[PDB]
Design a protein around this ligand. Structure first.
Ligand SMILES: CC(C)C[C@H](N)C(=O)NS(=O)(=O)OC[C@H]1O[C@@H](n2cnc3c(N)ncnc32)[C@H](O)[C@@H]1O
Ligand SMILES: [Zn+2]
Ligand SMILES: [Zn+2]
Length: 811
């Protein structure tokens, strides 16, 4: 008897499904929008990417079989840093590189049996797409959400461009994890995402997202209870307003500090102090923003010779000016609480200012004298009627008290900063603005879009050296101001890649509209995404920016929903056993030579055998005569441990790869691609094929019609197991518990073998085989479709999803 052979059959069914267009989505839909994060065409796809994309295909096939109108699209996040950095590493032009990668990616996806509605394909680096990035940018400008500002920004020396706050990971560039980000002062473009901070925070509650992702966004937004407190100046009419997120420490404010540029610094300066103060103010203006915001420099300042009254204690406190207080932040003035702010502590210690504790540390009380500030929450003390109140709650109590007495007002702030979107790079969407010498910054008219990216052919030309490559192309920027008509200069910076990906899911609903980013009617019929699948690494990047874009577009009246992804599933990373290098073992201690330690990226030069076991590593004898340390590591190019689709599928097969991935572990967890896994997929698929082939002849001469109630013995038992399996598989699929759905099919397959030990091929058995192939389709579509055609005329896409028999479940 012949055995399962994936070789010719897979290509056959792949073409069949495409020609039939089973996965084509209607312009207007029950519907299911199954979306996976489109890739950066920066390289070849490996099984890691395929875990993400196979998961989407499984769900899309299942939903399509159930009769839902399914939208399952694919596209290319082809603009920005990912694509350009990769292309430039190999001295290749970004456009050539991108399209070659897209070609390869499409093949990798097709070879795995993944089906998309390719008629909705989008390529962000194309004018047909980015002209709408510009359209959206213009709307944000008009709505007060896009502005230009000068200030300190993050800068990656390797990328040679500024980066948004979300693109800085552990102080490192999101693309160059080995390069620390630097600070610079430049005038850039920002998207006022903070205007939506409260809604972004509040709307997380109804989302069917992993709690871990919600927590990351909440912490990134960082809402804080603060207050603006008023301090009366002795002998003067003015009451100095100060901003603080620690209103709970008010009774501990022993002095005030005004920014050198604050108007009151010179105005309140005593006559005999004016000279010294004026000298300090001028010296402060000579410093740069960076120098002023320095965090480890010496403490300097001058006593103005004026006093203020602490509104809570009614006590007199000195007023100083010091360059560590920034004029552009808050009110440009602060109340200093040395006992609970380390910077204030050091300033107070240096200039002999009072230090008063008002927040006591739970457990062991703070010592006297205080050697450093206590900045964590505690219990209020020496705070009048507030004594005994827990810090955080105390903030609210003090704010209410201040407002009631007219001594200040509550002020909520967010750690979240506005989104820096301009980049000094060539490969990206040109910002649709013009700079006129007379009018200032003027927007390009909507009807003039798109502002085409100049077609530069010299790669050395495109390479970023510090300024935007466009700054060297007058044929591009020299233009006329749309307002006055005189000579003007087009903006030379481009939009970051995340602008493109913040709404691509909406473009899929109307990929060819050349009058609007999309028609509200079409978008509203498909939105929101019912199930989004993608990596957690996007928690405060794409998964935050998108929510912002959608809320904005909703406010524009183009989108009914306010949340783009109703369901989100973050898939665990696929890992691969990776060789890190030789080691030497002596007793229970493993010595790691520098090269090996460096590749492992750990500070230990020595590990116990237990440490090796615990980190999931093992020592394997190597032909070089030494022991090497191997450990599963995230599958990626940089690691050189990628398992590419083309080669694997050629030597093994798509269903083998799909089962290996899907059965390895719960999808939310990480998994290690292994030979044992591959062999296990082979064993399972061979076992399915063998069961059907063994009974093929009898099955062909058997009818599938029978009366459930009339079944008895093993026949009745099989019918029950069949429906129990259908229930388990259906529910598991709906919850994306793909590994247990497969385990259920493996279990039922065992029941089929057991059944045949006692019973011949029967109508109920034929029906069990029919349902089995249907339930198998989402997972191993090629084999299921192949076996299905041995007995039936239509495709598995046309037979639908098996109907569950509730009664069969009883007892
Ligand atoms: C939605 C946009 C911002 C996504 C962006 N283009 C992007 O993240 N692209 S990507 O780097 O090509 O990744 C695409 C998805 O594949 C997932 N992925 C990569 N490597 C993986 C491994 N080793 N295991 C599992 N999943 C992997 C990545 O998380 C993205 O979801
Ligand atoms: Zn970088
Ligand atoms: Zn003008």
């Amino acid at each position: 008897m012949e055995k399962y052979n994936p070789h010719a059959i897979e290509a056959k069914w792949q073409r069949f499904w495409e020609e039939k267009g089973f996965m084509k989505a209607k312009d207007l839909p029950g519907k299911q929008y199954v979306l996976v994060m489109f890739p950066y065409p920066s390289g070849d796809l490996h099984m890691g990417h395929l875990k993400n994309y196979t998961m989407g295909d499984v769900l899309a096939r299942f939903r399509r079989m159930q009769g839902y109108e399914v939208l399952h699209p694919m596209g290319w996040d082809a603009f920005g840093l990912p694509a350009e950095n990769a292309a430039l590493k190999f001295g290749v032009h970004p456009k050539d590189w991108t399209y070659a990668n897209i070609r390869q990616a499409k093949e990798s996806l097709r070879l795995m049996g993944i089906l998309y509605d390719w008629d909705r394909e989008v390529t962000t680096c194309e004018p047909e797409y980015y002209r709408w990035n510009q359209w959206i940018f213009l709307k944000m400008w008009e709505k007060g959400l896009a502005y230009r500002a000068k200030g300190l920004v993050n800068w990656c020396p390797k990328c040679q461009t500024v980066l948004a706050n979300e693109q800085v990971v552990e102080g490192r560039c999101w693309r160059h994890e080995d390069t620390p980000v630097e600070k610079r002062e430049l005038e850039q473009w920002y998207l006022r995402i903070t205007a939506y901070a409260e809604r972004l925070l509040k709307d997380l509650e109804g989302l069917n997202w992993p709690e871990k992702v919600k927590a990351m966004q909440r912490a990134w937004i960082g809402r804080s209870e603060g207050a603006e407190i008023l301090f009366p100046v002795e002998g003067k009419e003015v009451r100095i307003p100060v901003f603080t997120t620690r209103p709970d420490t008010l009774f501990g404010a022993t002095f005030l500090v005004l920014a050198p540029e604050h108007p009151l610094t010179l105005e309140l300066a005593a006559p005999e102090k004016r000279e010294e103060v004026l000298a300090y103010v001028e010296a402060a203006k000579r410093k740069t923003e960076i120098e002023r915001q320095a965090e480890g420099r010496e403490k300097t300042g001058v006593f103005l010779g004026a006093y203020a009254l602490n509104p809570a204690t009614g006590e007199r406190i000195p007023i100083w000016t010091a360059d560590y207080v920034l004029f552009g932040y808050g009110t440009g003035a602060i109340m200093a609480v040395p006992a609970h702010d380390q910077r204030d502590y050091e300033f107070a210690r240096k200039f002999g200012l009072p230090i008063k504790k008002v927040i006591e540390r739970p457990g062991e009380p703070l010592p006297e004298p205080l050697e450093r500030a206590y900045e964590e929450p505690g219990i209020m003390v020496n705070s009048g009627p507030f004594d005994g109140t827990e810090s955080e709650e105390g903030k609210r109590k003090v704010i209410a008290w201040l407002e009631e007495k007219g001594l200040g007002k509550g002020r909520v702030t967010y750690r979240l900063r506005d989104w820096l979107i301009s980049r000094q790079r060539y490969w990206g969407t040109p910002i649709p603005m013009v700079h006129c010498e007379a009018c200032g910054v003027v927007p390009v008219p909507e009807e003039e879009l798109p502002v085409l990216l100049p077609d530069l052919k010299d790669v050395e030309d495109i390479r970023p050296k510090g300024k935007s490559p466009l700054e060297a192309h007058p044929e591009f920027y020299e233009t006329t101001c749309p307002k006055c008509g005189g000579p003007a200069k087009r903006d030379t910076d481009t939009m970051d890649t995340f602008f493109d990906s913040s709404w691509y899911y909406l473009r899929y609903t109307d990929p060819h509209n050349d009058r609007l980013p999309f028609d509200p009617e079409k978008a509203n019929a498909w939105m929101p995404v019912d199930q989004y699948i993608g990596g957690v690494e996007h928690a405060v990047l794409h998964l935050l920016y998108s929510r912002f874009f959608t809320k904005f577009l909703h406010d524009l009246g183009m989108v009914k929903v306010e949340e783009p992804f109703q369901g989100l599933f973050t898939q665990g990373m696929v890992l691969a056993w990776t060789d890190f290098g030789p080691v030497e073992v002596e007793g229970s201690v493993v010595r790691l030579p520098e090269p090996t330690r460096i590749r492992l990226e750990i500070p230990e030069s020595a590990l116990s055998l237990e440490d090796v076991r615990k980190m999931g590593a093992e020592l394997r004898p190597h032909e070089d005569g030494t022991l090497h340390l191997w450990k599963p590591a995230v599958m990626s190019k940089s690691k050189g441990n990628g398992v590419m689709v083309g080669p694997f599928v050629k030597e093994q097969g798509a269903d083998i790869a799909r089962i290996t991935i899907l059965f390895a572990a719960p999808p939310e967890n990480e998994m290690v691609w292994t030979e044992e896994g591959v062999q296990g997929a082979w064993r399972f698929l061979n076992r399915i094929y063998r069961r059907v082939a063994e009974d093929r002849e009898a099955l062909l001469e058997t009818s599938g019609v029978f009366q459930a109630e009339a079944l008895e013995g093993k026949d009745r038992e099989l019918y029950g197991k069949l429906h129990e399996t259908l229930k388990k598989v259906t529910e598991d699929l709906e919850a994306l518990r793909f590994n247990t759905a497969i385990a259920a099919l493996m279990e039922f397959l065992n029941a089929l073998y057991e059944y045949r030990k006692d019973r011949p091929v029967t109508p109920v058995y034929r029906t069990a085989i029919r349902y089995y192939l249907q339930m198998l389709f989402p997972f191993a579509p090629h084999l299921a479709e192949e076996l299905w055609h041995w007995f039936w005329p239509d495709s598995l896409f046309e037979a639908g999803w098996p109907e569950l028999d509730e009664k069969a479940l009883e007892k």
